[PDB]
């Protein structure tokens, strides 16, 4: 039992320096990760003594807080437990960190490998005495072509002294890329000695580097290099094969297939997938990359041997935070209480192949092979090529459809027909047409004498930057892809459809190179029924804008679409998921759910707001339509993003649009199930909901509908995803609690009693709704790990993403926490905090996504330079919170219920 000596400082106060001490180090260590080499940010932070010092001291501080709170007289077991999870998984990191090596391995068809080579970089130092036949030392050094750091070193080996000082290194091209030449003194004895050693790069110590000395101590030897270590067994591989989806070089899979050979004199095998390892003898190996020869493999290896610890400490975690969230005490249980007892030839043919729905209902269901490996039905091709050549939806009363069948069979008026949109001036009068915009035809772009205008201006844009783009190079590059689109099109490599002959990889060809297949092939009937449906499609069409039968052109599509049953392999998909893709395409809830929501939130406010600054409740028929209606329109949510899951057969929020989608999700949950009893929620989650679907919407985001990265395949994406951005949906409804709860403070004027209460009940109901968050962040953040321990090859490596998660676990912890030291001011303290914390979370999930370098780039882009306007939202937010201040004074703990409290 712990006596109080002066030594037992131990307090709250001192828990949150030390978590903001640790946050601050973390996000100065995540920058320096930036503007210098991710080398330089292992120094200095995370490989730095006192790092491991403010570790252990926050262990200490949480057994020293929880010995002071008296937490195991009272019962209090979920908090110790769910606390005590802290301690464990720190105990695992610390002994991986002490303990745990990792290495990279290589490794060529046929090839026995038992050896295996790190990835840190490491200098060797070995002497000889004429007695004493070797003795070696290695040390390790952090310095490369970005930063350098003085190596002195003082040991004694065969006995007597030697010092090391090292002073720089110059990066000439000798060759092998920069051998890195280094210069450096020593002192062995008396002898003073002046030296130069050069290593390869992240390859073996060759001997031509390795460098001999023979003064004082007999002979001696140092190099610089990369290390190796000898396994107990032996691996040999006989296959590297990587399976790329059918008509794409986008690699799908990766595998290798691997023999294991030890005094089990049996051999033993297994295959490797990029999200599948092994385990043997206390090693374990993913897949990481191959020979670009395609027949070699390479491997990474981890000896950790902290891994149960930490993952029995996960598992506390995880059962602590179910059991607060269903504690009869704690609290959670109390602030749902408390809240329970508040109150609150033919150049008008447009018209004419208009009306062609008859063609149309079955044209939009033949399948066709895109190029990213996904099979599509033609309707989902269609929407596509046409709104990315013309940006609104519909060029004329055509749907896209109807422009795309125009523009395929009529190449000589829709070539020559003004479609084309385009957003620069200097573009357009570059090309010597009119200022007016006006979505510029195909033909207009190259002269018949000419070859193609813009051609010496993207050769000379697209290469320099992304970073700093101009008016005039973005739009250049945007209507060269355009006008490459249209191209696509004319030419007819886009219809990828009328074969599945089983020639290629498993692509399917186009009508041109499928006529020149089955011509090559003695596949005459084939090739005599292609051209069957080729005339007979033409003609069909030549009637329909002639006159208006139709039916030839609809007879020759559901001619293709038998071909399709008949010919096609396991690839063609079930005619329920055309109907599915085609009513997704037709009915996309998530283009019109935005505004609704806005429109509604802002509405709801304002009747709740007009209740509460005068002294009368809202009737509950309004809460109950509003509710109904807010039910209604989530189902309508959740039913598109199942109709999005099914048609995708994979999870819904795996590419940074989905993952917008899915936030908007998890905010619009929080609102209609958890809250549903308050008004102020309800508005707050819609309001959120609509804002980040705009944002979504804004067009940056690419929504179309693609297949997976091979990494991405695992179970653990089902898991680790939806409780991590479910957590911001959480976090966000806190956020605009903050704010609704500053604009309370804003109207109180002690004439007004029903503020006070509304105050009163918005500080619970949003330090619930941040438990809540906390919670599933943690959860989400620490299982994640256990998925990164299996795709990247280590739990936790300080990756961008990873440090700025612990960060906003730590702000969010602190503010959770500062309701023990700081009384008297507790609502406003806590609206600043909910509303200043999110910062943390808009960090980590934009700027770690566009900003920052990091490894977790499931969802990341090219960097635009930040806006003023975020700049000028924060001051608004730090202006508003200093007027606020001058009405802060409203203690927590206050009385009468009704009239107040
Ligand atoms: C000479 C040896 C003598 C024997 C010593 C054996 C060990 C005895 C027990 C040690 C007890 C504490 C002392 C150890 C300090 C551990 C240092 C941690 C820092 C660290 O490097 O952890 C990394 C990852 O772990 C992580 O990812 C941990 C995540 C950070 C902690 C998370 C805390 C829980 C979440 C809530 C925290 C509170 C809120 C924070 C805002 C390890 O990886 P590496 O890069 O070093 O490995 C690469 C080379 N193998
Ligand atoms: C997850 C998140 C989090 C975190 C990070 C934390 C972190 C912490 N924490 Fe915590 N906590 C929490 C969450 C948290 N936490 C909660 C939720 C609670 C509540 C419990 C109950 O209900 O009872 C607490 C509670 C608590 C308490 C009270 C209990 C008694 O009875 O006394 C204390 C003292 C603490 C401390 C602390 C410390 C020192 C730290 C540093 C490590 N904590
Ligand atoms: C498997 C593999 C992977 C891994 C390993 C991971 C790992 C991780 N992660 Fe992750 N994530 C992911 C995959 C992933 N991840 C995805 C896919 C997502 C969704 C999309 C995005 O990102 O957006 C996420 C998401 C996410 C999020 C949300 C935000 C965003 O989204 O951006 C977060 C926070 C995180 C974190 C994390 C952490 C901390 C970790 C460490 C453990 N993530």
């Given at each position: 039992?712990?006596?109080?000596?002066?030594?037992?400082?131990?307090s709250?106060?001192?828990?949150?320096?030390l978590?903001?001490?640790?946050?601050?180090?973390?996000?100065?260590?995540?920058?320096?990760?930036?503007?210098?080499?991710?080398?330089?940010?292992?120094?200095?932070?995370?490989?730095?003594?006192?790092?491991?010092?403010?570790?252990?001291?926050?262990?200490?501080?949480?057994?020293?807080?929880?010995?002071?709170?008296?937490?195991?007289?009272?019962?209090?077991?979920?908090?110790?437990?769910?606390?005590?999870?802290?301690?464990?998984?720190?105990?695992?990191?610390?002994?991986?960190?002490?303990?745990?090596?990792?290495?990279?391995?290589?490794?060529?068809?046929?090839?026995?490998?038992?050896?295996?080579?790190?990835?840190?970089?490491?200098?060797?130092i070995?002497?000889?005495?004429?007695?004493?036949?070797?003795?070696?030392?290695?040390?390790?050094?952090?310095?490369?072509?970005?930063?350098?750091?003085?190596?002195?070193?003082?040991?004694?080996?065969?006995?007597?002294?030697?010092?090391?000082?090292?002073?720089?290194?110059?990066?000439?091209?000798?060759?092998?890329?920069?051998?890195?030449?280094?210069?450096?003194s020593?002192?062995?004895?008396?002898?003073?000695?002046?030296?130069?050693?050069?290593?390869?790069?992240?390859?073996?110590?060759?001997?031509?580097?390795?460098?001999?000395?023979?003064?004082e101590?007999?002979?001696?030897?140092?190099?610089?290099?990369?290390?190796?270590?000898?396994?107990?067994?032996?691996?040999?591989?006989?296959?590297?094969?990587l399976?790329?989806?059918?008509?794409?070089?986008?690699?799908?899979?990766?595998?290798?297939?691997?023999?294991?050979?030890?005094?089990?004199?049996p051999?033993?095998?297994?295959?490797?997938?990029?999200?599948?390892?092994?385990?043997?003898?206390?090693?374990?190996?993913?897949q990481?990359?191959?020979?670009?020869?395609?027949?070699?493999?390479?491997?990474?290896?981890?000896?950790?041997?902290?891994?149960?610890?930490?993952?029995?400490?996960?598992?506390?975690?995880?059962?602590?935070?179910?059991?607060?969230?269903?504690?009869?005490?704690?609290?959670?249980?109390?602030?749902?209480?408390?809240?329970?007892?508040?109150?609150?030839?033919?150049?008008?043919?447009?018209?004419?192949?208009?009306?062609?729905?008859?063609?149309?209902?079955?044209?939009?269901?033949?399948?066709?092979?895109?190029?990213g490996?996904?099979?599509?039905?033609?309707?989902t091709?269609?929407?596509?090529?046409?709104?990315?050549?013309?940006?609104?939806?519909?060029?004329?009363?055509?749907?896209?459809?109807?422009?795309?069948?125009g523009?395929?069979?009529?190449?000589?008026?829709?070539?020559?027909?003004?479609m084309?949109?385009?957003?620069?001036?200097?573009?357009?009068?570059?090309?010597?047409?009119?200022?007016n915009?006006?979505?510029?035809?195909?033909?207009?772009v190259?002269?018949?004498?000419?070859?193609?205008?813009?051609?010496?201006?993207?050769?000379?844009?697209?290469?320099?930057?992304?970073?700093?783009?101009?008016?005039?190079?973005?739009?250049?590059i945007?209507?060269?892809?355009?006008?490459?689109?249209?191209?696509?099109?004319?030419?007819?490599?886009?219809?990828?459809?009328?074969?599945?002959?089983?020639?290629?990889?498993?692509?399917?060809?186009?009508?041109?190179?499928?006529?020149?297949?089955?011509?090559?092939?003695?596949?005459?009937?084939?090739?005599?029924?292609?051209?069957?449906?080729?005339?007979?499609?033409?003609?069909?069409?030549?009637?329909?804008?002639?006159?208006?039968?139709?039916?030839?052109?609809?007879?020759?599509?559901?001619?293709?679409?038998?071909?399709?049953?008949?010919?096609?392999?396991?690839?063609?998909?079930?005619?329920?998921?055309?109907?599915?893709?085609?009513?997704?395409?037709?009915?996309?809830?998530?283009?019109?759910?935005?505004?609704?929501?806005?429109?509604?939130?802002?509405?709801?406010?304002?009747?709740?707001?007009?209740?509460?600054?005068?002294?009368?409740?809202?009737?509950?028929?309004?809460?109950?339509?509003?509710?109904?209606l807010?039910?209604?329109?989530?189902?309508?949510?959740?039913?598109?993003?199942?109709?999005?899951?099914?048609?995708?057969?994979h999870?819904?929020?795996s590419?940074?649009?989905?993952?917008?989608?899915?936030?908007?999700?998890?905010?619009?949950?929080?609102?209609?199930?958890?809250?549903?009893?308050?008004?102020?929620?309800?508005?707050?989650?819609?309001?959120?909901?609509?804002?980040?679907?705009?944002?979504?919407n804004?067009?940056?985001?690419?929504?179309?509908?693609?297949?997976?990265?091979?990494?991405?395949?695992?179970?653990?994406?089902?898991?680790?995803?939806?409780?991590?951005?479910?957590?911001?949906?959480?976090?966000?409804?806190?956020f605009?609690?903050?704010?609704?709860?500053?604009?309370?403070?804003?109207?109180?004027?002690?004439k007004?009693?029903?503020?006070?209460?509304?105050?009163?009940?918005?500080?619970?109901?949003?330090?619930?709704?941040?438990?809540?968050?906390?919670?599933?962040?943690?959860?989400?953040?620490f299982?994640?790990?256990?998925?990164?321990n299996?795709?990247?090859?280590?739990?936790?490596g300080?990756?961008?993403?990873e440090?700025?998660?612990?960060?906003?676990?730590?702000?969010?912890?602190?503010?959770?926490?500062?309701?023990?030291?700081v009384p008297?001011?507790?609502?406003?303290?806590?609206?600043?905090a909910?509303?200043?914390?999110?910062?943390?979370?808009?960090?980590?999930?934009?700027?770690?996504?566009?900003?920052?370098?990091?490894?977790?780039?499931?969802?990341?882009?090219?960097?635009?330079?930040?806006?003023?306007?975020?700049?000028?939202?924060?001051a608004?937010?730090?202006?508003?919170?200093?007027?606020?201040?001058?009405?802060?004074?409203?203690?927590?703990?206050?009385?009468?219920?009704?009239?107040?409290?």
């Amino acid at each position: 039992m712990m006596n109080i000596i002066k030594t037992l400082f131990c307090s709250m106060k001192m828990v949150l320096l030390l978590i903001g001490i640790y946050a601050t180090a973390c996000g100065i260590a995540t920058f320096i990760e930036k503007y210098e080499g991710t080398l330089a940010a292992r120094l200095w932070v995370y490989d730095a003594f006192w790092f491991e010092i403010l570790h252990i001291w926050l262990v200490a501080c949480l057994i020293g807080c929880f010995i002071t709170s008296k937490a195991w007289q009272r019962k209090k077991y979920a908090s110790l437990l769910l606390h005590a999870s802290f301690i464990v998984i720190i105990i695992g990191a610390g002994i991986t960190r002490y303990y745990g090596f990792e290495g990279l391995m290589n490794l060529r068809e046929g090839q026995s490998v038992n050896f295996i080579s790190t990835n840190t970089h490491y200098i060797f130092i070995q002497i000889k005495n004429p007695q004493g036949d070797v003795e070696s030392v290695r040390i390790p050094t952090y310095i490369d072509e970005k930063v350098n750091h003085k190596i002195n070193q003082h040991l004694t080996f065969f006995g007597k002294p030697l010092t090391l000082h090292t002073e720089e290194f110059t990066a000439k091209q000798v060759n092998m890329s920069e051998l890195f030449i280094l210069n450096a003194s020593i002192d062995f004895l008396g002898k003073n000695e002046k030296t130069l050693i050069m290593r390869d790069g992240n390859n073996a110590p060759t001997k031509e580097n390795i460098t001999m000395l023979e003064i004082e101590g007999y002979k001696i030897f140092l190099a610089w290099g990369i290390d190796n270590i000898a396994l107990p067994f032996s691996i040999k591989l006989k296959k590297f094969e990587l399976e790329r989806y059918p008509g794409s070089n986008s690699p799908a899979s990766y595998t290798s297939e691997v023999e294991v050979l030890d005094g089990q004199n049996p051999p033993l095998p297994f295959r490797i997938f990029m999200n599948n390892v092994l385990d043997y003898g206390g090693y374990r190996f993913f897949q990481s990359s191959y020979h670009p020869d395609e027949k070699g493999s390479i491997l990474s290896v981890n000896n950790d041997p902290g891994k149960t610890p930490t993952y029995i400490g996960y598992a506390m975690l995880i059962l602590g935070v179910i059991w607060l969230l269903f504690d009869k005490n704690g609290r959670f249980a109390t602030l749902g209480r408390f809240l329970k007892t508040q109150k609150f030839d033919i150049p008008s043919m447009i018209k004419a192949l208009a009306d062609t729905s008859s063609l149309t209902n079955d044209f939009d269901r033949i399948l066709v092979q895109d190029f990213g490996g996904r099979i599509k039905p033609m309707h989902t091709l269609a929407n596509e090529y046409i709104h990315k050549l013309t940006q609104q939806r519909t060029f004329k009363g055509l749907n896209p459809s109807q422009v795309f069948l125009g523009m395929l069979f009529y190449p000589q008026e829709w070539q020559s027909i003004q479609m084309i949109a385009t957003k620069s001036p200097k573009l357009r009068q570059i090309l010597g047409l009119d200022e007016n915009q006006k979505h510029i035809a195909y033909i207009d772009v190259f002269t018949p004498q000419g070859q193609y205008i813009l051609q010496n201006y993207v050769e000379a844009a697209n290469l320099k930057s992304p970073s700093l783009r101009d008016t005039f190079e973005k739009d250049v590059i945007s209507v060269d892809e355009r006008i490459n689109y249209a191209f696509l099109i004319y030419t007819g490599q886009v219809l990828r459809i009328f074969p599945d002959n089983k020639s290629p990889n498993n692509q399917w060809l186009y009508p041109l190179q499928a006529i020149s297949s089955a011509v090559a092939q003695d596949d005459t009937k084939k090739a005599k029924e292609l051209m069957q449906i080729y005339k007979k499609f033409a003609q069909g069409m030549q009637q329909g804008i002639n006159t208006h039968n139709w039916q030839e052109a609809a007879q020759a599509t559901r001619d293709i679409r038998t071909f399709q049953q008949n010919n096609g392999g396991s690839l063609l998909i079930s005619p329920a998921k055309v109907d599915s893709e085609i009513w997704l395409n037709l009915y996309n809830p998530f283009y019109q759910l935005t505004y609704p929501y806005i429109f509604i939130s802002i509405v709801l406010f304002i009747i709740v707001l007009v209740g509460i600054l005068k002294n009368t409740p809202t009737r509950p028929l309004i809460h109950k339509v509003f509710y109904i209606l807010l039910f209604a329109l989530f189902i309508l949510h959740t039913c598109g993003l199942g109709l999005r899951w099914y048609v995708s057969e994979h999870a819904p929020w795996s590419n940074a649009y989905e993952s917008m989608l899915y936030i908007a999700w998890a905010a619009i949950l929080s609102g209609v199930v958890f809250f549903r009893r308050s008004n102020l929620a309800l508005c707050a989650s819609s309001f959120l909901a609509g804002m980040t679907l705009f944002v979504a919407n804004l067009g940056d985001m690419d929504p179309q509908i693609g297949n997976l990265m091979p990494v991405l395949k695992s179970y653990w994406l089902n898991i680790h995803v939806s409780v991590i951005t479910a957590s911001y949906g959480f976090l966000g409804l806190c956020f605009m609690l903050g704010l609704i709860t500053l604009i309370m403070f804003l109207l109180r004027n002690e004439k007004r009693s029903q503020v006070d209460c509304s105050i009163l009940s918005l500080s619970a109901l949003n330090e619930m709704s941040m438990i809540l968050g906390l919670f599933l962040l943690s959860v989400g953040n620490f299982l994640g790990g256990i998925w990164a321990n299996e795709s990247w090859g280590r739990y936790w490596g300080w990756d961008s993403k990873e440090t700025w998660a612990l960060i906003s676990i730590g702000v969010y912890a602190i503010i959770l926490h500062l309701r023990f030291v700081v009384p008297k001011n507790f609502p406003f303290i806590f609206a600043s905090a909910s509303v200043i914390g999110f910062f943390s979370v808009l960090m980590t999930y934009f700027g770690v996504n566009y900003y920052l370098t990091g490894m977790h780039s499931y969802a990341a882009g090219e960097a635009e330079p930040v806006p003023l306007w975020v700049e000028l939202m924060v001051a608004g937010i730090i202006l508003l919170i200093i007027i606020a201040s001058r009405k802060r004074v409203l203690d927590m703990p206050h009385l009468h219920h009704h009239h107040h409290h």
